[PDB]
RNA sequence: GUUUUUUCACUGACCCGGUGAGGCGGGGGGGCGAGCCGGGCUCUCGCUUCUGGCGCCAAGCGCCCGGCCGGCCGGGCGCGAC
């Protein structure tokens, strides 16, 4: 299953490859509004882990909290 | 223990600018096409006093370069301006008083 | 197509009407302000016979949501007649008086007598 | 002949001369909040240094190749909601009185016989959302001798199967008359991806400046030289 | 001149030869500034025809 | 090579200003000064300064096409405004 590959790449966050994405998203999540609908999981692979799945009444909002 | 007068500046209220008469914001022209490459000529409609400002302020009166509409500014008078003088602004204008070049 | 002007704007996309697959209150509401409830009673007052045997008046004590309008259809459609102007008053009391005055066709002493105010 | 009153009413544009005209204003439009964003994420993906596993997406099975591969890939679609019943039918008459090679369609299903080694050849998209869905698997396809290619489009690669979008497409069994066509596109396919993958490890994306910036530095270079 | 001089929101009620003078910025421009507007919108546009004529003319001999 | 560090300049986060986000940056065409005997290069500028007018909602020229009876009656599309 590819959900494994996607879960230990997600672990490696100080590779090049997850810098780069943790990056340009971080850019992009910035100019939205703090609390706004994402129209489907970013990390579909870790939503699958906290009880998420893929069906209708489910809903995942992308909300920043100040730090 | 108690607040001075200064700290008691900053929250307004009382200390705020009365700003009933004033006579808008004397703003230089915005920068276009017509500041940049060339000038734009305006007319003096009317050199005028503004409450609390020392400057009498000259309403300068340009014609829009992109609608119909005519554009009325609030410019700090230059001493020696008048009124029913044009008034040239922009890179191609020439350097007497009363106008705004780069 | 060529952006005319500068700024981006809402394009007017199409909004459909309601067409709801049931009415949320199933009756439509019987009307409360009839032409019964509106009008109470008349005033049987020393002040209010002598306005109906002189300025050709009948003297209604009226629901105080009621209209000049609603009292003119009202006062026609229980006693058959026909209103020149309707003043109304809200007195200290809190009950809304209506000074009917009617068309110079009718006497106000020869209906009031057909009400039955003496 | 000619009516003398029609006559030439020139307009000059010069500088406080007219009213400049309705020209073009798209490249200078005030555009909504989303479309700046979606725009200045294209452009950052020019800017920033992409590292070569983002990168080898951009690396796509040109047109000709693309448009050959998906003439095969339209015999072996899996069929639809409406034509699965027409199997289920005949189950109902022949009970009263071999199922075919298909496509294999998503991440999980393509992944685990890349693993198994039965993928013949894996079509990925380039365009997945988040992309460490798909990262892996041109690396993983390389490692277990698998050729894969990338198309452009998971919409495109989405119509194969009966749905909106998918990342990846195998194909595991072909008719044995469409054998010859899947070992030609594989010679064409290994030689563009799996063989030069050493190279594809090496070949950072972006890092590469504004038109207008490029311009000013090749312009101080001739002021130089 | 020739304009009455009532309370604005009244002009709806008085007819159109009362708030007007039968003339070009009739009731909205004095005689004298547009008398000195007629020359000016002429006396412009000819001094813009001796420009336009010493133009081309400063064209020939080079 | 690896890595520290100072100095230059880079933009792409981040910031500021302006605006109704209205001509930005390259290239092409055209003008004059400068140059070898009709040719082209190293470059330049880009229409408004005598006046307390007027100035938008296209002229013109191309390009297509809808009745009556080739010749009489209306729209669309370019370029003008690269």
Redesign the pocket.
């Given at each position: 299953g590819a959900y494994k590959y996607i879960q230990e790449l997600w672990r490696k966050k100080q590779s090049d490859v997850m810098r780069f994405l943790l990056?340009v998203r971080?850019?992009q999540y910035?100019?939205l509004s703090a609390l706004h609908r994402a129209p489907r999981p970013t990390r579909p692979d870790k939503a699958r882990r906290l009880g998420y799945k893929a069906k209708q009444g489910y809903v995942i909002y992308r909300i920043r909290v100040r730090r | 223990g108690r607040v001075i007068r200064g700290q008691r500046k900053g929250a307004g209220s009382v200390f705020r600018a009365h700003v009933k008469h004033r006579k808008g914001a004397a703003?230089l022209r915005?920068?276009?096409?017509?500041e940049?490459?060339?000038?734009?000529?305006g007319?003096?409609?009317?050199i005028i006093h503004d409450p609390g400002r020392g400057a009498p302020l000259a309403k300068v009166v340009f014609?829009?370069?992109?609608?119909?509409?005519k554009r009325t500014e609030l410019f700090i008078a230059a001493e020696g301006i008048?009124?029913?003088?044009?008034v040239?602004?922009?890179?191609?204008?020439?350097?007497?008083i009363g106008?705004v070049?780069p | 197509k060529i952006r005319?002007?500068?700024?981006?704007r809402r394009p007017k996309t199409l909004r459909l009407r309601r067409q709801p697959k049931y009415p949320r209150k199933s009756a439509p509401r019987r009307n409360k302000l009839d032409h019964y409830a509106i009008i109470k009673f008349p005033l049987t007052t020393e002040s209010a016979m002598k306005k109906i045997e002189d300025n050709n008046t009948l003297v209604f004590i009226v629901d105080v949501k009621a209209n000049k309008h609603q009292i003119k259809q009202a006062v026609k459609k229980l006693y058959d007649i026909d209103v020149a102007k309707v003043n109304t008053l809200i007195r200290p009391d809190g009950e809304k008086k209506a000074y009917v005055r009617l068309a110079p066709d009718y006497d106000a002493l020869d209906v009031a007598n057909k009400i039955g105010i003496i | 002949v000619?009516?003398p009153?029609?006559?030439?009413?020139?307009?000059?544009?010069?500088?406080?001369?007219?009213?400049?005209?309705?020209?073009d204003?798209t490249?200078?439009?005030?555009?909504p909040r989303y479309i700046?964003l979606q725009r200045?994420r294209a452009?950052?993906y020019?800017?920033?240094?992409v590292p070569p596993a983002i990168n080898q997406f951009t690396q796509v099975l040109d047109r000709q190749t693309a448009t050959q591969l998906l003439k095969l890939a339209h015999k072996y679609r899996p069929e639809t909601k409406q034509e699965k019943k027409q199997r289920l039918l005949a189950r109902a008459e022949k009970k009263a009185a071999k199922r075919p090679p298909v496509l294999r369609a998503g991440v999980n299903t393509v992944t685990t016989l890349v693993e198994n080694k039965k993928a013949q050849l894996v079509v990925i998209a380039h365009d997945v959302d988040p992309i460490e869905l798909v990262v892996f698997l041109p690396a993983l396809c390389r490692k277990m001798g698998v050729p894969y290619c990338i198309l452009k489009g998971k919409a495109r690669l989405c119509r194969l199967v009966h749905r909106k979008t998918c990342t990846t497409v195998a194909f595991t069994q072909v008719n044995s008359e469409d054998k010859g066509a899947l070992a030609k596109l594989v010679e064409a396919i290994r030689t563009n991806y799996n063989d030069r993958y050493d190279e594809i490890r090496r070949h950072w994306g972006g890092?590469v400046?504004?038109?207008?910036?490029v311009?000013?530095?090749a312009?101080?270079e001739?002021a130089k030289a | 001149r020739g304009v009455r001089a009532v309370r604005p929101k009244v002009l709806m009620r008085l007819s159109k030869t009362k708030k007007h003078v039968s003339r070009a910025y009739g009731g909205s421009m004095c005689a004298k500034?547009v008398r000195?507007?007629?020359?000016?919108?002429?006396?412009?546009?000819?001094?813009?025809i001796?420009?336009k004529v010493l133009?081309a003319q400063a064209q020939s001999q080079?």
């Open positions: 990056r971080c850019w910035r100019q | 703003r915005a920068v276009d096409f017509a940049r490459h060339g000038y734009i000529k007319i003096v409609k009317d014609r829009d370069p992109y609608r119909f509409k008048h009124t029913g003088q044009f040239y602004c922009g890179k191609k204008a020439q350097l007497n106008n070049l | 005319t002007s500068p700024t981006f | 000619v009516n009153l029609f006559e030439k009413r020139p307009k000059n544009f010069g500088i406080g001369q007219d009213i400049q005209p309705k020209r204003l490249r200078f439009v005030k555009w700046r200045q452009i950052l020019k800017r920033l240094k890092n400046l504004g038109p207008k910036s311009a000013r530095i312009k101080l001739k | 500034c000195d507007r007629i020359k000016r919108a002429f006396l412009i546009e000819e001094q813009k001796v420009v133009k080079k």
